[PDB]
Design a protein around this ligand. Structure first.
Ligand SMILES: CCC1=C(C)/C(=C/C2=NC(=C\c3[nH]c(/C=C4\NC(=O)[C@H](C)[C@H]4CC)c(C)c3CCC(=O)O)/C(CCC(=O)O)=C2C)NC1=O
Ligand SMILES: CCC1=C(C)/C(=C/C2=NC(=C\c3[nH]c(/C=C4\NC(=O)[C@H](C)[C@H]4CC)c(C)c3CCC(=O)O)/C(CCC(=O)O)=C2C)NC1=O
Ligand SMILES: CCC1=C(C)/C(=C/C2=NC(=C\c3[nH]c(/C=C4\NC(=O)[C@H](C)[C@H]4CC)c(C)c3CCC(=O)O)/C(CCC(=O)O)=C2C)NC1=O
Ligand SMILES: CCC1=C(C)/C(=C/C2=NC(=C\c3[nH]c(/C=C4\NC(=O)[C@H](C)[C@H]4CC)c(C)c3CCC(=O)O)/C(CCC(=O)O)=C2C)NC1=O
Ligand SMILES: CCC1=C(C)/C(=C/C2=NC(=C\c3[nH]c(/C=C4\NC(=O)[C@H](C)[C@H]4CC)c(C)c3CCC(=O)O)/C(CCC(=O)O)=C2C)NC1=O
Ligand SMILES: CCC1=C(C)/C(=C/C2=NC(=C\c3[nH]c(/C=C4\NC(=O)[C@H](C)[C@H]4CC)c(C)c3CCC(=O)O)/C(CCC(=O)O)=C2C)NC1=O
Ligand SMILES: CCC1=C(C)/C(=C/C2=NC(=C\c3[nH]c(/C=C4\NC(=O)[C@H](C)[C@H]4CC)c(C)c3CCC(=O)O)/C(CCC(=O)O)=C2C)NC1=O
Ligand SMILES: CCC1=C(C)/C(=C/C2=NC(=C\c3[nH]c(/C=C4\NC(=O)[C@H](C)[C@H]4CC)c(C)c3CCC(=O)O)/C(CCC(=O)O)=C2C)NC1=O
Ligand SMILES: CCC1=C(C)/C(=C/C2=NC(=C\c3[nH]c(/C=C4\NC(=O)[C@H](C)[C@H]4CC)c(C)c3CCC(=O)O)/C(CCC(=O)O)=C2C)NC1=O
Lengths: 160, 160, 162, 58, 158, 158, 160, 158, 160, 162, 158
């Protein structure tokens, strides 16, 4: 979390929170209402976002669901949609936390070698997450959409 | 010497010399005249020390000067005795220095490698150094005999 | 490092000879001055902080621009480093006086010091002035013979720098 | 002085996996001098590790 | 370590579910109390040396035998180590006041502390009395807001 | 570590005799089996990625609750580590298959593993299930020539 | 002690005591009667030494015992005198041990942190220890006073 | 480590009092015995290699099984480690003899030594026999001045 | 063995056996029959090789068994011939293993310390081992003699 | 380090070409000499200490002032350092002979060695004489064809030091 | 530029004092070394071509890549400039040896040399290696009398 990062910075120097760290924590606490609003909108609309992103991704990359595709079959396609749901939930976690530590800890550390070992196409995942970003931005206001897009883009850059 | 050892020990600790180190140096410098007298005594009798030492060594290790020996012949026996001369001069250095440092750098570090490369047997060296101990401590009074015996014991241990 | 005794030892080892009358005179001369050196070292060690305070105060009074802004000794860090270097010079002069030989000043102090100071921008003339200030302050504590001895090593440091 | 035996478990949860053998530095028992104890205590804590056992040899 | 938000996040990640109404409620309560906790922490930090001095004085007034020859705090070194442990307690309870979670106390403080003290011969009840004294000194300045973290430390030793 | 020849050497050295006819016979038998074991090891090496992939799939089809939120294999990092452990097991079983003796498994793999998994929380029976699935895949691809080493890993775990 | 320091030295290089270290141990055992005499004089006269040192220190620095001073009040003044007594007993230990190790272990390590956090003026402690040093020198001969002054000035220099 | 003088100082510091008459008497007793102790230590040091050689010979004549194949002293490596350990015992007993106190033997030799020997499989009764043979040799050379330190080693190993 | 070295080299890099390592293992397996033949000839004739080597060594150096020699007496000569037997056995071990690892682990590591402490003349040992190598070369064919001489010369080089 | 094989691979890779007949001739020549090189390496490793003993004996016979006081090889420490230098020279010469290539001598021995010897005061001409002594003894041990092969790397070291 | 006498004169003038006894002694010491320094300078001047030849040979034996295509010494012009630079170093070090002061090197050689080399891509560590090789050759001919001056040039490039 933002608070956790400030406290770890203080702890590494065996000191108290510096004025910069206090100002950071105050700004993070001030941003709480808009963070909660964005996360609640994304959480209430998770099924819509994931279904729409999956639809767009399979419409742009039909090979994945076709026979011989990585997501071919009902079970494997369900796992693909579940991964999109995982990444949307991680985006909401990062939005609430004010940093990307939950996203890294839960979902990104090791994801790249995981997908490479499972033959999962990372361009496909990136397309799905971009579709999820668009679906989320459709449900959010432009200012809130930018805040969510920060974390959607963080996930995309982690994969790319 | 005592002074150099104390200074280096203090320097690796970035401090001024302690009361203990200064007491050591006071004891060293107040003992300097006696040490110089003992060194003069051992220098005066250098040729006798070397001669009876070589006599005893070759009497108790006759194989060294027998055919096939390391010191066999006249020139090899001369080199043998020249080594005892080297080591006696090192002992006098160590006595004026107040420790076995000059002995250690000039004559102890690398000695096993050098007598391996020279086929000089080290038990012979230990016997020769012990013979020099006996001859040399025969020439001094009670306290000086033990003090010089300590340096000769240092050599004997370092050669073994 | 090399002290006076090991200096005699090294000369005689290199030339491969036992000690003679001349070596014994040099060694007697070192031993005779030993108590004065030990006394001076104890006095300097007991007074080192006071010596550094007085010498740094005299230096910064004579050259106030060092500790005002734009000076090399202007910050708490650079002031602390300045008096730290003065602690070096006092401590290594005390070592060289106790050893009776300047070899430690060559090995442990003077080697590369001009290059360090010229790279840092540290003014060497002001450093020599500070060394002189320590020389007078130390002489004020140790007395005639010890002052004359310590001044040799302070001047060696000054010459090595300047 | 005195030596203290620390048995600790220090996971790798902050970084990705690797093919190299890693088990010995993750779970270990070492004793260190008293003057090194605080740095090692804090280093184990900082890497998310757990201090399992502390003993004073003697 | 965890703060309150990451603790709620880790819970929801344990069920693998999004935030529901109660989770957002906990988060918004934490955001509401953040400013008060920040002011309490800044007050503690501003008076750290004073709090530590008073707390050490209280500890050693109630238990003078800790300082007497043979006591665990009798030397300059052991007294310094005692006061340094109390400084740790103050700093990390302040961290936990800012975070809103006693995690940092568990990972960075109480983890192996009891075994360390027993292996060293440090008396646990005397350290608990010191934590209680420090708690009282802090509550005399910032109110009852840091009480839970000092209680957590004391029970972790207890 | 030891191989079969070095193990026979240690057995002759403990009792301090020269190699006798029986010892030479055992060594000769080990030398006779070398080509098959080498080809088996090369076959495992050339298909290590595949073997790992369907062995992980077999484990997680057998026990899907490992992957579920709250399971020990639920995160990208923990799944990575699970598959990495299975890579450890495959590579060291292949080492033991080339050596002909299981000492390398005992020193490099099994030494402290159970304690480390208890400390970490990795379920031993699920890890053994993964080891048995990997054994099944390896035996399907090369035959029964590597079963002893996988059984050794499993027994050392359980 | 001096013996312990020589043993630790020989143990670091994993060897027996060298001639210099034997000289240190012998010269220390020689000084035993003188050290015991000095320690007896300082110990039996601890009360008057501490009273005199405290009087001199308070005359030199009245603000310490003035209201708002670190030593103001009966309790704080008593602890001040107790600290002076502690340092006198540590000096006696240093004289007996022939080195400063007990002084470091019991009194000096951490005394700077202790006095900084308790707001104790270190120059005042230095003044009191100097006063104790002169009061001890009043009670000792020139050689005994010189022996004690080494450890007194060692304490003072550790303060400063 | 502690010598006798530092042991006395530690007792007086634990009690918090200056040296008294009996403490100075103990210190004077140590200063009185110091010269004889130094002479004995110098004698041991001068003949350390010879002492080690007959002590090893006495132990291995007493227990030839150790040198036989399958014994703990059977290899050049394990023989070297055994004589190395005996040299440790001799040198640290000499240290303790000079120091007048057995502490250095405790924190430098016996601390964790039994656990080390069980982990290695070293026969402790045989090590005690080696220490006893060393005791006999040293007593034959310098007298009974070092007996208590060798007894301390033997009892701390038992 | 050769196999163990290949495996350890592969394990240090956390990888499977490389084609060069596989070639090494395959070549060692192919050589196994010749290795077994040489080891069998050496083992079946250990008594005569050791006897001939001991006779040749003692003839070259009668002083080793003369009064005052390191191997003087029946017990010490038996230990001498036992040492030579040990080195012959370790040569068979190294011939079979395909590397020198058993020779190092069982008899080479620490032998220099052992013999130096026992004052065993290492040149005497080397002469005995060279005599054993000649005895072995007598019974073996030229290629087999070269194969055994590799490990014989390894022992000799390790001692010198 | 590069061997003959890797030298050919380096040329053809920087030229981006497949092996032609000339490359195969060169690689074939290296394989042909490989057995001779292996035998010479085994002979040198078996006799390494004897080679160092005889060559240092020759060097200190021709220049006896090196081992007397004032010589750079007078002390046990400096004598040991000298024979250790000779041992390293012999081992790297054997490496280069096995590889059929002097690259390892450039990469591990010669670079900065002359400047180090100048800074320490090691007499470089005497070092070259010791290398020539090692060459003569080694060539006596290993036979004529191996002598021609091994002397090339000995001379490469001698020229690098001269 | 300055020499030793002018350096001492400027030092005494910065203090506005006359020459003291120590200053006269320093000037006398400089005058006493004049004959050896002049013979050394003449020896260098007589063998300048050989010194430069062996220095360049040593440089390019250490680093043959410099002469290969794409090296900074690869062309007739670039090799010419390299040997001309070393010739400048030799002549100006001889000047500084005669004067007894390194000011001529600072005035005529290091006046923008490091900036010039960094701008042109002249490899400075290689240039320092060449300067040090020339130092070695000059020392082999005349001894250490010139070493410091060569070191100055190296320090001017680093
Ligand atoms: C909460 C943290 C977390 C993440 C992120 C995660 C991803 C993840 N997806 C997996 C499989 C999979 N992942 C996918 C998804 C891919 N298929 C399509 O091509 C798309 C491009 C793409 C998704 C957008 C598919 C189809 C599989 C099944 C592949 C198989 O089993 O062979 C696996 C291997 C184990 C399993 O089958 O569940 C993981 C670990 N798991 C986690 O615990
Ligand atoms: C930019 C960072 C910086 C600082 C802060 C700094 C402080 C500083 N203060 C000095 C003197 C001084 N400073 C003080 C200040 C003290 N008087 C009372 O005790 C107060 C507690 C306290 C001030 C509130 C005094 C009294 C002196 C004169 C001390 C003396 O000469 O003995 C000096 C010595 C030279 C001079 O007088 O200019 C320095 C360098 N230097 C720096 O480079
Ligand atoms: C070569 C010898 C060797 C072994 C054997 C070894 C095992 C091992 N596995 C680890 C992590 C792990 N290992 C697993 C294994 C999985 N957990 C369950 O889901 C599965 C049933 C099971 C595998 C089939 C997991 C999940 C972790 C991560 C645990 C965590 O970080 O919380 C760790 C902790 C360090 C790290 O995270 O990399 C070790 C030491 N390490 C070694 O150096
Ligand atoms: C940031 C997390 C952290 C903690 C919690 C911590 C506690 C801690 N306290 C220690 C010692 C100590 N702790 C104490 C304090 C106790 N003794 C007094 O009587 C009091 C009753 C009581 C304190 C109120 C003392 C006296 C010691 C010294 C032990 C000794 O040397 O005998 C040590 C041993 C290391 C050392 O002293 O250098 C640790 C690790 N260290 C850490 O890095
Ligand atoms: C045996 C080793 C040892 C030492 C060295 C030692 C010093 C020491 N002095 C202390 C307090 C004190 N020390 C002093 C002494 C000061 N008063 C004046 O300012 C003077 C400048 C100066 C003395 C000359 C005073 C007044 C206190 C009480 C301060 C307070 O209560 O906050 C304390 C804090 C705990 C206590 O109250 O006792 C220590 C640890 N304690 C030890 O166990
Ligand atoms: C100075 C402090 C210190 C001590 C005390 C010490 C003891 C010690 N002895 C060891 C091994 C050993 N110790 C012995 C000695 C035994 N063999 C038996 O036959 C004999 C009866 C008996 C000795 C009299 C042997 C044979 C080994 C080798 C064990 C092995 O490697 O299998 C080891 C294992 C590490 C190694 O091999 O170097 C230690 C730590 N080490 C230390 O640093
Ligand atoms: C299997 C590994 C192994 C080896 C290699 C080994 C060699 C070995 N030989 C020893 C004694 C000995 N070794 C020799 C033989 C030497 N002296 C003669 O002069 C010859 C030159 C030379 C033999 C060719 C002798 C005479 C002794 C007895 C020395 C004594 O105890 O005083 C000892 C000391 C223990 C004992 O036997 O009393 C060892 C460790 N021991 C092993 O367990
Ligand atoms: C100052 C430190 C120092 C020492 C000690 C030293 C010893 C030394 N002894 C040498 C020769 C020798 N040294 C000996 C001595 C041995 N003969 C018997 O075996 C005895 C056991 C033993 C002497 C008591 C012999 C016989 C030689 C002649 C070797 C030969 O001819 O090859 C040589 C070879 C060069 C020469 O002969 O001039 C050195 C360097 N060198 C040093 O720089
Ligand atoms: C009298 C005072 C004086 C000095 C000191 C001097 C040095 C000097 N060397 C130069 C170029 C150069 N210097 C070098 C020398 C380098 N080549 C590398 O391989 C070597 C490591 C190294 C020499 C040891 C080279 C190759 C150039 C030409 C660079 C270019 O033109 O690209 C230049 C730039 C202009 C020119 O090319 O002539 C100057 C000014 N010139 C002067 O008038």
């Amino acid at each position: 979390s933002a608070i956790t990062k400030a406290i770890l910075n203080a702890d590494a120097e065996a000191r108290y929170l510096s004025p910069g760290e206090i100002d950071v924590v105050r700004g993070y606490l001030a941003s709480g209402e808009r963070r909660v609003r964005v996360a609640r909108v994304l959480s209430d609309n998770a099924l819509r976002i994931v279904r729409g992103a999956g639809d767009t991704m399979f419409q742009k990359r039909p090979d994945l669901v076709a026979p011989g595709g990585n997501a071919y079959g009902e079970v494997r396609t369900a796992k693909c949609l579940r991964d999109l749901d995982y990444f949307l939930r991680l985006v909401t976690y990062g939005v609430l936390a004010g940093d990307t530590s939950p996203i890294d800890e839960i979902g990104l550390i090791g994801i790249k070698e995981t997908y490479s070992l499972l033959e999962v196409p990372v361009p496909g995942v990136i397309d799905g997450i971009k579709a999820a970003k668009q679906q989320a931005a459709a449900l959010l206001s432009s200012e809130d959409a930018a805040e969510a897009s920060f974390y959607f883009d963080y996930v995309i850059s982690a994969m790319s | 010497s005592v002074v150099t050892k104390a200074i280096v020990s203090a320097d690796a600790e970035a401090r001024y010399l302690s009361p203990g180190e200064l007491d050591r140096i006071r004891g060293f410098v107040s003992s300097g005249e006696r040490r110089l007298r003992v060194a003069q005594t051992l220098t005066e009798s250098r040729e006798r020390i070397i001669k009876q030492a070589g006599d005893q060594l070759f009497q108790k290790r006759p194989d060294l000067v027998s055919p096939g020996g390391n010191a066999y012949g006249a020139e090899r026996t001369a080199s043998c005795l020249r080594d005892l001369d080297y080591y006696l001069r090192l002992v006098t250095f160590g006595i004026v220095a107040g420790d076995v440092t000059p002995i250690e750098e000039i004559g102890v570090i690398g000695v096993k490698e050098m007598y391996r490369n020279l086929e000089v047997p080290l038990p012979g060296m230990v016997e020769a150094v012990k013979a020099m101990k006996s001859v040399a401590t025969g020439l001094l009074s009670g306290d000086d005999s033990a003090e010089v015996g300590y340096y000769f014991d240092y050599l004997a241990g370092a050669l073994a | 490092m090399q002290d006076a005794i090991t200096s005699v030892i090294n000369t005689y080892d290199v030339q491969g000879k036992y000690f003679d009358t001349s070596a014994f005179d040099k060694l007697k001369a070192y031993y005779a001055t030993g108590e004065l050196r030990v006394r001076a070292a104890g006095t300097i060690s007991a007074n080192a902080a006071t010596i550094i305070k007085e010498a740094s105060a005299k230096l910064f009074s004579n050259q106030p621009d060092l500790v005002r802004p734009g000076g090399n000794a202007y910050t708490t860090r650079r002031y602390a480093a300045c008096v730290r270097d003065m602690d070096y010079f006092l401590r290594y002069a005390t070592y060289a006086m106790l050893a009776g030989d300047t070899s430690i000043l060559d090995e442990r102090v003077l080697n590369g010091l001009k290059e360090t100071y010229n790279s840092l921008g540290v003014p060497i003339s002001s450093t020599v002035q500070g060394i002189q200030a320590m020389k007078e302050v130390t002489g004020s504590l140790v007395g005639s013979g010890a002052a004359k001895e310590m001044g040799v090593y302070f001047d060696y440091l000054s010459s090595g720098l300047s | 002085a005195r030596t203290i035996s620390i048995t600790a478990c220090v996971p790798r949860r902050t970084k990705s996996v690797g093919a190299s053998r890693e088990i010995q530095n993750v779970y270990f028992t070492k004793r260190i001098s008293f003057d090194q104890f605080t740095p090692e205590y804090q280093r184990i804590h900082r890497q998310g590790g757990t201090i399992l056992n502390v003993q004073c040899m003697g | 370590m965890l703060d309150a938000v990451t603790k709620i996040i880790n819970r929801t990640d344990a069920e693998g579910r999004y935030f529901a109404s109660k989770d957002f409620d906990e988060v918004t309560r934490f955001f509401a109390t953040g400013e008060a906790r920040l002011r309490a922490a800044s007050t503690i930090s501003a008076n750290a040396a004073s709090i530590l001095r008073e707390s050490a004085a209280a500890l050693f007034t109630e238990q003078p035998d800790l300082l007497r020859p043979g006591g665990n705090a009798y030397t300059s070194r052991r007294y310094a180590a005692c006061v340094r442990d109390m400084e740790y307690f103050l700093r990390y309870a302040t961290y936990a006041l800012v975070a809103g979670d006693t995690s940092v106390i568990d990972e960075r403080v109480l983890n192996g502390l009891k075994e360390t003290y027993m292996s060293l011969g440090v008396p646990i009840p005397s350290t608990v009395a010191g934590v209680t004294a420090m708690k009282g000194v802090v509550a005399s300045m910032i109110g009852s807001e840091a009480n839970v973290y000092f209680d957590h430390i004391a029970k972790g030793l207890s």
